[PDB]
Scaffold this active site. Structure first.
Site, PDB file in Angstrom:
ATOM      1  N   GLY A  74       0.845  -1.228   0.000  1.00  0.00           N
ATOM      2  CA  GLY A  74       0.000   0.000   0.000  1.00  0.00           C
ATOM      3  C   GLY A  74       0.859   1.248   0.000  1.00  0.00           C
ATOM      4  O   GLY A  74       0.772   2.063  -0.940  1.00  0.00           O
ATOM      5  N   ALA A  75       1.763   1.364   0.968  1.00  0.00           N
ATOM      6  CA  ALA A  75       2.657   2.535   1.098  1.00  0.00           C
ATOM      7  C   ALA A  75       3.485   2.689  -0.183  1.00  0.00           C
ATOM      8  O   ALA A  75       3.591   3.799  -0.666  1.00  0.00           O
ATOM      9  CB  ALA A  75       3.563   2.335   2.286  1.00  0.00           C
ATOM     10  N   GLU A  98      -5.458  -2.305   8.137  1.00  0.00           N
ATOM     11  CA  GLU A  98      -6.834  -1.766   7.968  1.00  0.00           C
ATOM     12  C   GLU A  98      -7.813  -2.923   7.754  1.00  0.00           C
ATOM     13  O   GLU A  98      -8.888  -2.927   8.408  1.00  0.00           O
ATOM     14  CB  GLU A  98      -6.904  -0.759   6.830  1.00  0.00           C
ATOM     15  CG  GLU A  98      -5.911   0.401   6.962  1.00  0.00           C
ATOM     16  CD  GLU A  98      -6.111   1.321   8.161  1.00  0.00           C
ATOM     17  OE1 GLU A  98      -7.062   1.115   8.988  1.00  0.00           O
ATOM     18  OE2 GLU A  98      -5.410   2.331   8.241  1.00  0.00           O
ATOM     19  N   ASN A 147       1.403  -8.207   0.522  1.00  0.00           N
ATOM     20  CA  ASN A 147       0.283  -9.002   1.106  1.00  0.00           C
ATOM     21  C   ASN A 147      -1.041  -8.677   0.412  1.00  0.00           C
ATOM     22  O   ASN A 147      -2.076  -9.105   0.928  1.00  0.00           O
ATOM     23  CB  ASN A 147       0.244  -8.834   2.627  1.00  0.00           C
ATOM     24  CG  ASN A 147       0.098  -7.411   3.096  1.00  0.00           C
ATOM     25  OD1 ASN A 147      -0.243  -6.506   2.341  1.00  0.00           O
ATOM     26  ND2 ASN A 147       0.322  -7.212   4.367  1.00  0.00           N
ATOM     27  N   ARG A 148      -1.013  -7.964  -0.713  1.00  0.00           N
ATOM     28  CA  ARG A 148      -2.207  -7.775  -1.575  1.00  0.00           C
ATOM     29  C   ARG A 148      -3.261  -7.031  -0.763  1.00  0.00           C
ATOM     30  O   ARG A 148      -4.452  -7.293  -0.963  1.00  0.00           O
ATOM     31  CB  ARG A 148      -2.727  -9.131  -2.077  1.00  0.00           C
ATOM     32  CG  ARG A 148      -1.725  -9.946  -2.879  1.00  0.00           C
ATOM     33  CD  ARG A 148      -1.975 -11.451  -2.970  1.00  0.00           C
ATOM     34  NE  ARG A 148      -2.222 -11.984  -1.618  1.00  0.00           N
ATOM     35  CZ  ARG A 148      -1.281 -12.172  -0.667  1.00  0.00           C
ATOM     36  NH1 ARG A 148      -0.008 -11.977  -0.935  1.00  0.00           N
ATOM     37  NH2 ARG A 148      -1.606 -12.608   0.524  1.00  0.00           N
TER      38      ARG A 148
HETATM   39  C1  LIG Z   1       1.947   4.589  19.439  1.00  0.00           C
HETATM   40  C2  LIG Z   1       3.191   3.684  19.420  1.00  0.00           C
HETATM   41  C3  LIG Z   1       4.473   4.539  19.361  1.00  0.00           C
HETATM   42  C4  LIG Z   1       3.197   2.887  20.728  1.00  0.00           C
HETATM   43  O1  LIG Z   1       4.021   1.707  20.559  1.00  0.00           O
HETATM   44  P1  LIG Z   1       4.888   1.071  21.765  1.00  0.00           P
HETATM   45  O2  LIG Z   1       4.019   0.446  22.810  1.00  0.00           O
HETATM   46  O3  LIG Z   1       5.927   2.066  22.171  1.00  0.00           O
HETATM   47  O4  LIG Z   1       5.530  -0.124  20.891  1.00  0.00           O
HETATM   48  P2  LIG Z   1       6.781  -0.606  19.971  1.00  0.00           P
HETATM   49  O5  LIG Z   1       7.968   0.264  20.262  1.00  0.00           O
HETATM   50  O6  LIG Z   1       6.442  -0.820  18.514  1.00  0.00           O
HETATM   51  O7  LIG Z   1       6.892  -2.022  20.754  1.00  0.00           O
HETATM   52  C5  LIG Z   1       5.657  -2.701  21.179  1.00  0.00           C
HETATM   53  C6  LIG Z   1       5.955  -3.804  22.173  1.00  0.00           C
HETATM   54  O8  LIG Z   1       7.035  -4.666  21.715  1.00  0.00           O
HETATM   55  C7  LIG Z   1       8.056  -4.758  22.700  1.00  0.00           C
HETATM   56  N1  LIG Z   1       9.353  -4.958  22.016  1.00  0.00           N
HETATM   57  C8  LIG Z   1      10.125  -3.979  21.367  1.00  0.00           C
HETATM   58  N2  LIG Z   1      11.215  -4.486  20.836  1.00  0.00           N
HETATM   59  C9  LIG Z   1      11.155  -5.854  21.130  1.00  0.00           C
HETATM   60  C10 LIG Z   1      12.022  -6.923  20.820  1.00  0.00           C
HETATM   61  N3  LIG Z   1      13.126  -6.762  20.087  1.00  0.00           N
HETATM   62  N4  LIG Z   1      11.661  -8.164  21.250  1.00  0.00           N
HETATM   63  C11 LIG Z   1      10.520  -8.311  21.945  1.00  0.00           C
HETATM   64  N5  LIG Z   1       9.638  -7.383  22.310  1.00  0.00           N
HETATM   65  C12 LIG Z   1      10.011  -6.162  21.853  1.00  0.00           C
HETATM   66  C13 LIG Z   1       7.933  -3.488  23.550  1.00  0.00           C
HETATM   67  O9  LIG Z   1       8.582  -3.653  24.805  1.00  0.00           O
HETATM   68  C14 LIG Z   1       6.391  -3.383  23.578  1.00  0.00           C
HETATM   69  O10 LIG Z   1       5.820  -4.403  24.401  1.00  0.00           O
HETATM   70  P3  LIG Z   1       5.516  -4.027  25.938  1.00  0.00           P
HETATM   71  O11 LIG Z   1       6.852  -3.941  26.723  1.00  0.00           O
HETATM   72  O12 LIG Z   1       4.591  -5.153  26.386  1.00  0.00           O
HETATM   73  O13 LIG Z   1       4.811  -2.677  25.851  1.00  0.00           O
HETATM   74  C15 LIG Z   1       3.154   2.806  18.156  1.00  0.00           C
HETATM   75  O14 LIG Z   1       2.061   1.926  18.306  1.00  0.00           O
HETATM   76  C16 LIG Z   1       3.018   3.547  16.821  1.00  0.00           C
HETATM   77  O15 LIG Z   1       3.833   4.431  16.473  1.00  0.00           O
HETATM   78  N6  LIG Z   1       1.994   3.156  16.064  1.00  0.00           N
HETATM   79  C17 LIG Z   1       1.045   4.092  15.476  1.00  0.00           C
HETATM   80  C18 LIG Z   1       0.928   3.961  13.979  1.00  0.00           C
HETATM   81  C19 LIG Z   1       1.964   4.794  13.249  1.00  0.00           C
HETATM   82  O16 LIG Z   1       2.542   5.741  13.795  1.00  0.00           O
HETATM   83  N7  LIG Z   1       2.293   4.344  12.032  1.00  0.00           N
HETATM   84  C20 LIG Z   1       1.969   4.982  10.765  1.00  0.00           C
HETATM   85  C21 LIG Z   1       1.212   4.038   9.850  1.00  0.00           C
HETATM   86  S1  LIG Z   1      -0.411   3.643  10.557  1.00  0.00           S
HETATM   87  C22 LIG Z   1      -1.219   5.250  10.497  1.00  0.00           C
HETATM   88  O17 LIG Z   1      -2.176   5.616   9.790  1.00  0.00           O
HETATM   89  C1  LIG Z   2      -1.574   8.519   2.924  1.00  0.00           C
HETATM   90  C2  LIG Z   2      -2.182   7.591   3.933  1.00  0.00           C
HETATM   91  N1  LIG Z   2      -3.394   7.050   3.686  1.00  0.00           N
HETATM   92  C3  LIG Z   2      -3.927   6.251   4.635  1.00  0.00           C
HETATM   93  C4  LIG Z   2      -3.301   5.988   5.836  1.00  0.00           C
HETATM   94  C5  LIG Z   2      -3.885   5.040   6.859  1.00  0.00           C
HETATM   95  N2  LIG Z   2      -3.120   3.779   6.962  1.00  0.00           N
HETATM   96  C6  LIG Z   2      -2.308   3.519   7.978  1.00  0.00           C
HETATM   97  S1  LIG Z   2      -1.485   2.016   7.796  1.00  0.00           S
HETATM   98  C7  LIG Z   2      -2.381   1.698   6.350  1.00  0.00           C
HETATM   99  C8  LIG Z   2      -2.196   0.421   5.568  1.00  0.00           C
HETATM  100  C9  LIG Z   2      -0.789   0.243   5.033  1.00  0.00           C
HETATM  101  O1  LIG Z   2      -0.816  -0.836   4.080  1.00  0.00           O
HETATM  102  P1  LIG Z   2       0.594  -1.449   3.667  1.00  0.00           P
HETATM  103  O2  LIG Z   2       1.602  -0.379   3.396  1.00  0.00           O
HETATM  104  O3  LIG Z   2       0.289  -2.442   2.597  1.00  0.00           O
HETATM  105  O4  LIG Z   2       1.010  -2.266   4.995  1.00  0.00           O
HETATM  106  P2  LIG Z   2       0.389  -3.652   5.584  1.00  0.00           P
HETATM  107  O5  LIG Z   2      -0.421  -3.202   6.743  1.00  0.00           O
HETATM  108  O6  LIG Z   2      -0.390  -4.324   4.475  1.00  0.00           O
HETATM  109  O7  LIG Z   2       1.664  -4.417   6.017  1.00  0.00           O
HETATM  110  C10 LIG Z   2      -3.183   2.738   6.032  1.00  0.00           C
HETATM  111  C11 LIG Z   2      -3.998   2.878   4.797  1.00  0.00           C
HETATM  112  C12 LIG Z   2      -2.085   6.677   6.032  1.00  0.00           C
HETATM  113  N3  LIG Z   2      -1.424   6.622   7.185  1.00  0.00           N
HETATM  114  N4  LIG Z   2      -1.533   7.461   5.085  1.00  0.00           N
HETATM  115 MG   LIG Z   3       0.015  -4.397   2.496  1.00  0.00          MG
END
Ligand SMILES: CC(C)(COP(=O)(O)OP(=O)(O)OC[C@H]1O[C@@H](n2cnc3c(N)ncnc32)[C@H](O)[C@@H]1OP(=O)(O)O)[C@@H](O)C(=O)NCCC(=O)NCCSC=O
Ligand SMILES: Cc1ncc(C[n+]2csc(CCOP(=O)(O)OP(=O)(O)O)c2C)c(N)n1
Ligand SMILES: [Mg+2]
Ligand SMILES: [Mg+2]
Ligand SMILES: [Mg+2]
Ligand SMILES: [Mg+2]
Lengths: 584, 584, 580
Positions: free
Chosen positions: C447-448, C479, C473-474
């Site tokens: 997707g990205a 989501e 992963n299609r």
């Molecule tokens: C909000 C968050 C920062 C909060 O995440 P965190 O709880 O700080 O988690 P992470 O750092 O990813 O790690 C999660 C858990 O894995 C553990 N962890 C980390 N490293 C390891 C290793 N190497 N081995 C085992 N376990 C591990 C860590 O201690 C946490 O468990 P515990 O110790 O049990 O807590 C994150 O979820 C996030 O950024 N996601 C939002 C989506 C986003 O920003 N992405 C953009 C695309 S989606 C948007 O549209």
């Molecule tokens: C421009 C944009 N559109 C929508 C979103 C919401 N979003 C967060 S993760 C995600 C899916 C990402 O799909 P992919 O890159 O294929 O990763 P996968 O979860 O399949 O591993 C979407 C659409 C976003 N963050 N940015």
């Molecule tokens: Mg995907």
């Protein structure tokens, strides 16, 4: 300790715990919930005749005391009445909070009473302008906004918060009422880097004619570290309208009647909490032809504008000045230039002051405004101590004469870089309520005074012991002068021989009118004894001020003043070489 | 014909050719080039004490005359002083042009004198706010802005133009000086669609209790087509503050003392150039429980807000009303409901008017404000014709009493939907200069009057023959009442027994104070004979107005008034069924 | 020395003198005058397929090198194509300059070609956005804007400048060409106040379970002063996505797999150049129930947000860390809590890493994305040093796997707090051009990748030696999973079995598709050897990521994650009922 309380109650507690002991404003139903809670906590409410005046009072309070002040105004015209005073505080970089009323969330965009896009109107002239729609987060938002007013994530200046009336009435759970948001916070004190301190010390050692010009940031200090650096450096010293009173008048560096001579010849300009805006010729090489530049400030708003420093220190200015003074321990400065300026300044300033007591009437037979400054000078040590007096000035010609005529004040406020006419009375009120045992004297043009004259009522109702002296010249006279000089036609710049003493008496103040300059000392003595009081002085239209003679009314292309603009035009022609061709 | 002329000269010619015979403002060097050129062309310059007042005068001129009016103000505080008056004109949808000064292009962002982001501050409350940096295109920009003020590409309201002082001094070649930009333009007259006209005629034929409520758009007509439609339809008629004087008082439809009864029972609400904003209960079914809705206007700002029409006509309202009247040629309306309202209105309105002449003093022994309206009524046909008089009202309680007390005026202006206190004196000046042979009477609260009192000077210097009558109750009294009623604590809402007659005399006007209601007729007679004049009436704090009793000061969640809000709360609970659960 | 020169020439000289050796962009006539002068001065022009990608490249350059980077784009759609990348840089507080083209002054408001209100669109997401209409003052405006990008009068982030084409052609007299505006400037270094340093040292001495969490501002240092304070304080250490690589993994404080345990029990949270935004539970007492708070940063954007410090130090963070370390000279910290967390971290992280090598395929028969991270781990110390590699991650589930699967990296970049999908390829290009001798490996969701895939062309044409590994992963799978979990209706989240290797080859890159997880090591080895290269990995839809079932798709009222939100709901119930 904590139980559920309404937002409005928590706002009032926030304010009081942040050191707010008075709020300036004008009541409306949209802010009544906060107004009531401030009253219940013992916070003094200083209610005004025009909301703009309440924000000017807050500005004066903060500028004088260092304590961030608060104005509270109702939705719609209550908020829109503050725009000029907010802009003035933004230009001068003064921390203040404006709390505005606004309509309830459910009526968003429906045409509710007094609706207008307050946050959009204020966004360009504030550090933050927000509508608080989450009861649980209002306290956190207040504390962050207060920090941003001090200059966090921006630069010091006014912030605006509004809370929809439905949110004001919501309860906040006890867990969300966090002490870290309620409590007063100390000012930040970033410290200089030793290498920048040494570099500035080296520039001072190499300079023959170093000069310090102070501004707002220097005026947040008590001046003692600035005097240590003046002593260590041998620099000439100039202040600006925003930084009077930091350096004794008798100090060997203090050469305030030699402004042009200092700017022309200094080889090292050091700005201390000061902008190089129009008031200092944009720091242009056309105005400082020999100067290397160093800049010291706790905000980059006084480091990067128009000229960059060979060195720039971002730090609490006192600490910076102290550290540079220390670094110059074993330096023996060449003070010949400074001492020669000082010898001529001492005589020029003394002769000028003495001449204020006998200035001739103008060709129309009316008092020269200089006589107001002479009468104040004559009363000094008798019925008032000018060294304990807050002096305020406002207007056009009157203001320009006041910059030469007012030399001995504790503190000075005026129209500021923004040229904000009508600050005199509101500033006098804020100053008088902050310093109830100090004389407060505001000298104002009649044009400026008409904008905020009805705040004489406020002064009487709140017992602010102010003396307002009007330069009643029946004109916007600096404008009348620029019209005559540059267009030959004077139109729309005449006022009338209004009885400003009678306006003051109408609002319950002591009033007296003066036509004979020999009556001025007695009239001002009576005014000081019966404050709040106004003296209405019938002054001449035949009195060119330093500002009227330098073209401030004409607006040249490159600088505020004709002589600076002339130098700028010359600078732009330098060294173009064979590349040049006539605009035809 | 044409030769190279400076921008400033072409601006003045544009204005004059667009029908501008006066400009309201306050001089500064940034606009002096235009100021001078207007003077040279014979355009009258009405110079004021506060720039906001100049924009209020333009507003009154345009609202009264239909001719787009002009205010001219200098850079920085000159422009920021207009924000409230601009907002007021934006809310009321009044075409006007504000010309602001601004610093020269070369000093952009450098901290020049009086710099502030004017266009960003004004953008949210204007139809256009622009900085004109191309000399060649200034004329084109003025003409487009003038069109946008009329409502092209938006809706009617204020526009803002500024020209950097360097651009003002540039020459425009003769080819760019196009007559199509210089010449006055007629108003647009979009015409109704016959099918929409027929559909509205069918709704009127089916309705038993149709009602017309007029606004701004109706008030741009002479009322004759509205009366044709009232006659053809049998509809009840209500006006609003912005649409007084269109329908004779004796007309069978005119039921202005039956406002609630009309809204409660009408089965067909027809808005004519009117918003369904807070002043008409958001057009809510809670306030119009039986009404089908039709909307007629020349702007969708009076068609789509809060309620949609079963039919909506976007057209010049006169033409729409005439066409619907025509379509009802052979209809015989059922007028029983209208005629029953009218019979009770005739008696209620007559009894109310007669009682104004003898209203008892309040419990504090001072005059009830109703006596001011009675004294005006007593003088009608004697020393003035109220039917030729421009009546202005402003304040809180005073304004609410004035909406019942002022029935016979030529034209009426007031604080408007924005609740803009301080319009009285500036509006009176604009009205008096537009209609120099008409009585102009402004009745104002003392709170409101303090905002713009110093414009009495302007009235004297420009010989605007106004009469200002102050309801001097020593309070922001509607606010004092809401404090007492809803919080038990009156604080920051008291004023003082100020000598407003003495303020007027200080500024060269005729002044008189009245404490005995039996002296009112004589004092107002003397004021009319000696205009500009002020009558300072010592009035009671014991006088609840219709607005104080309906909670206007409290700001309910859904409506401006408690009774409407109560109905709204009931409406929101209807028919939720088993789905409902307690907020716990 | 100086002669009259056009604005366009002085702009190019400003940039080169400020250390700009490359400009990312896409040509248009409105910017051609500058484009030409940059070329003539030997400033490299990296021309892209979409303007947004040029600004992503600038972002990556500044974040990795500390040198403020520059994108240049034409009027109208050239500038509007940057808005997402500008917003991303604003959220992450990355200095960068965008130079936009715009129509000539005489056509203002007349409907000229490509006109749109660029400065109004960008004002809310920039530190400055200006139209420069005075030729004489362009150089002064550039230098001030550059200072504001660093954070003067605001906070670090992107700035926008545009010059109408008529102004670009105007001459600047030699007197106005001031050396103080042309020259490169050092970063500011405000110093800590000794009383604040002593106060923080006193809180550390009194704490039993102190914990340091780092962010952007810590990542502007080399980490040596941070390690000095960890050693002096006995604090546990957590990084964030924006601050990886400052502290050796073997350091006794490094407890990355114990994040929850650290937040739950710390009695002293110290933020170092870090915001308490959604990624740290808003610093809520609901998430840090035992923590006193101290905040250190060179910007109040990392001092005042959501939580206030009992002490807040506004200073260059390295200096602050060094001074607090010094103040603790004779302190012997109790490290039992730290050492207990480290012992459990060591086992958990080791078991997790080893399991990456053998993760079974999902129920649909396709590769589990963890195998990608296992293959990279298997290659480490053999085919490449991951400790010298710039790792980039992007996507949904793929990114969540990446946060635990990527443990060794020289530097790490990702979608950021803004969740900006499509950064992988442009970031990889900026990184590869900045560090031509370092392996650069970008792992992305499909997707990205679709957002910026055509920038593979850019990588090929500019010799950016990147490796892109797609989790094909299609689906927008994180989501699809939230829909399945919370609605029982999956709609509009499926993609197809696209040939991303074939896309790469069409743009002249090396491509390989992988369906058998045992082939991943070889495919990634071949990609590294033939960079620029893409590996298209056919992955499962049937695998919960660490982010799965945490309410990320639901968007709770108070917190990004359900468990944090539940704690906030419980916090708001405390003492309610208790008025009397
Ligand atoms: C909000 C968050 C920062 C909060 O995440 P965190 O709880 O700080 O988690 P992470 O750092 O990813 O790690 C999660 C858990 O894995 C553990 N962890 C980390 N490293 C390891 C290793 N190497 N081995 C085992 N376990 C591990 C860590 O201690 C946490 O468990 P515990 O110790 O049990 O807590 C994150 O979820 C996030 O950024 N996601 C939002 C989506 C986003 O920003 N992405 C953009 C695309 S989606 C948007 O549209
Ligand atoms: C421009 C944009 N559109 C929508 C979103 C919401 N979003 C967060 S993760 C995600 C899916 C990402 O799909 P992919 O890159 O294929 O990763 P996968 O979860 O399949 O591993 C979407 C659409 C976003 N963050 N940015
Ligand atoms: Mg995907
Ligand atoms: Mg005002
Ligand atoms: Mg005057
Ligand atoms: Mg009153």
């Amino acid at each position: 300790a904590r139980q559920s309380v309404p937002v409005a109650s928590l706002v009032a507690e926030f304010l009081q715990e942040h050191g707010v002991d008075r709020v300036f404003g004008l009541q409306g139903g949209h802010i009544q919930p906060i107004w009531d809670q401030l009253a219940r906590r013992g916070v003094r409410i200083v209610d005004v005749r025009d909301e703009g005046s309440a924000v000017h009072m807050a500005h004066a309070h903060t500028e004088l005391t260092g304590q961030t002040a608060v104005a509270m105004v109702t939705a719609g015209p209550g908020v829109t009445n503050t725009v000029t005073a907010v802009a003035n505080a933004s230009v001068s970089r003064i921390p203040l909070l404006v709390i505005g009323g606004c309509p309830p969330i459910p009526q968003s965009n429906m045409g509710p009473l007094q609706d207008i896009p307050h946050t959009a109107i204020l966004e360009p002239i504030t550090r933050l302008a927000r509508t608080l729609r989450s009861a649980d987060q209002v306290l956190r938002e207040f504390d962050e906004a207060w920090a941003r007013a001090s200059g966090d994530r921006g630069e010091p200046g006014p912030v605006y918060l509004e809370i929809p009336t439905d949110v004001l009435r919501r309860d906040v759970p006890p867990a969300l009422q966090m002490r870290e948001h309620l409590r007063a916070k100390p000012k930040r004190r970033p410290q200089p880097h030793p290498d920048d301190v040494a570099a500035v010390a080296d520039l001072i050692r190499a300079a023959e004619k170093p000069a310090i010009i102070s501004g707002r940031g220097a005026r947040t200090t008590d001046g003692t570290d600035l005097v240590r650096l003046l002593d260590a450096s041998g620099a000439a010293y100039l202040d600006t309208q925003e930084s009077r009173g930091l350096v004794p008048d008798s100090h060997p560096a203090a050469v305030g009647s030699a402004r042009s001579a200092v700017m022309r010849d200094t080889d090292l300009l050091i700005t201390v909490g000061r902008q190089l805006d129009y008031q200092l010729g944009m720091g242009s090489p056309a105005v400082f032809p020999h100067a290397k530049v160093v800049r010291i400030a706790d905000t980059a708003s006084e480091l990067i504008d128009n000229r960059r420093g060979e060195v720039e220190i971002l730090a609490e200015p006192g600490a910076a000045l102290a550290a540079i003074a220390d670094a110059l321990k074993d330096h023996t400065p060449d003070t010949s230039w400074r001492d020669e300026l000082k010898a001529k300044h001492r005589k020029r300033a003394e002769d000028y002051r003495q001449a204020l007591h006998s200035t001739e009437n103008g060709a129309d037979g009316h008092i020269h405004p200089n006589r107001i400054f002479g009468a104040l000078d004559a009363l000094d040590g008798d019925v008032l101590d000018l060294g304990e007096t807050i002096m305020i000035a406002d207007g056009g010609d009157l203001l320009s004469f006041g910059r030469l005529g007012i030399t001995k004040a504790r503190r000075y406020l005026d129209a500021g870089a923004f040229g904000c006419l009508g600050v005199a009375t509101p500033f006098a009120i804020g100053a008088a309520l902050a310093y109830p045992d100090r004389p407060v004297v505001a000298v104002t043009g009649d044009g400026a005074f008409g904008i905020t004259a009805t705040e004489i009522d406020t002064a009487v109702r709140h017992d602010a012991k102010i003396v307002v002296i009007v330069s009643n010249n029946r004109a916007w006279n600096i404008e009348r002068y620029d019209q005559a000089e540059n267009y030959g036609l004077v139109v729309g710049t005449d006022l009338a021989d209004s009885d400003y003493a009678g306006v003051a008496r109408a609002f319950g103040a002591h009033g007296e009118r003066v036509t004979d300059p020999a009556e001025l000392e007695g009239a001002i003595r009576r005014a000081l004894a019966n404050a709040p009081a106004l003296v209405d002085v019938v002054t001449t239209q035949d009195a060119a001020s330093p500002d009227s003679g330098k073209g401030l009314g004409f607006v040249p292309d490159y600088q505020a003043l004709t002589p600076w603009n002339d130098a700028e035009v010359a600078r732009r022609q330098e060294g173009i070489g064979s590349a040049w061709s006539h605009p035809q």
